[PDB]
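Quick one, T. Sequence first:
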Amino acid sequence: EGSNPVDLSKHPSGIVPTLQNIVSTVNLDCKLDLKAIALQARNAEYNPKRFAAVIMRIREPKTTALIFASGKMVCTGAKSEDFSKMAARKYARIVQKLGFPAKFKDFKIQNIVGSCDVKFPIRLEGLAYSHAAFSSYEPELFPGLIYRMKVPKIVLLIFVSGKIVITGAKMRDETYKAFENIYPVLSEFRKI
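Structure tokens:
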């Protein structure tokens, strides 16, 4: 039974990108007294002159939650969508247990960041000259090439070293498809 470690149907390049951060939001559906939550929770920080939300942190899943007065909560740091949702539930429950009537409505993934290393140098200048409508490479202003992909709606950061950052996905597979879509062109521009 030679099942394959990597499914080349899903990853023709034979390379699987790593998910580095998933950010999600959920509506707690209630106004929140930020000074009280900050006072009452051990795991909270709240400096409204620096950021208008209470900062809460947990170790499992190792993440950070930004809880706004409106009741909106942003959860960041998770490595999978299941873990982003699991952590969001855990922060929302902490809030209920403090005595606020927190709900868990319209939870949604807002952004997934993935990285990948093809491990060969890339001629970004040539790549950009050949794909002018989608790329920006301006070494004196920022390092790496910015590539705006249409389908899926992703923005990639391609560095001269072969390291790539894939941002903007709403689900794991989009991050994978974005990479596969760009792979043949990275390859076409391998620094000989």
